[PDB]
Amino acid sequence: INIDRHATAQINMLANKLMLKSSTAYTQKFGIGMTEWRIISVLSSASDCSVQKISDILGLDKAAVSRTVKKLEEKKYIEVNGHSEDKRTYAINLTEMGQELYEVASDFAIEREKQLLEEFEEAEKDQLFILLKKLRNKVDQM
């Protein structure tokens, strides 16, 4: 059966294989899984990361984010910031060790991304981001 022109199928097989390889890579190099890495990278980039905000950004459901954030808490990479004395909700933050992890693992993330796009011309990269965002806009409508 031909699913070459099946966008969902193509994108899912691409994403799944990339994620599986990354699971191995991050685990062997840094002792964390791919999903742990995705969350750490979100925490380094954004402010007031609730579980909701991390889920919105990554597309993983809240249960998945919550379970991973708990693991990262146990590994002492993140801590829950209650903001007890502030007119705002709790937030998840990197600990000092989680920040160090990000510092060292981000170089590896950057190299893998460079590798993924090795054969792309500059305009092809631009075209790629535009088309993914168009897809991302339609999905939000479905």
Next chain:
Amino acid sequence: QKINIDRHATAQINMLANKLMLKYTQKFGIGMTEWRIISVLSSASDCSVQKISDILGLDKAAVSRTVKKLEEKKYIEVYAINLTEMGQELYEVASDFAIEREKQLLEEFEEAEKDQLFILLKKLRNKVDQM
């Protein structure tokens, strides 16, 4: 910080696959977790419970249970996990049946844009194979 997520193709791809996933399948006699696992197994060979649990953000116990259930249903065999021919058929048939959702997804795309999308996705899959 060091990485701009908005211009990080790895991140956009993975997010889009997840977002497409949370949006038929009960039609074919399996639930969401079963479908997600089937999908992962279709993407690459000799998967492990550990890897699947990682990338799906699921606990190992849940993954193991679901894997067993898919064994019983004749979709999987076995620790390297692979799809049976019938597991692979399930993925293709259920995808082929869901074609109307694909047309909806690509509604705002001209033919030239669809062509570009598939050209670019193919470059990406080719490269992932080499990584």
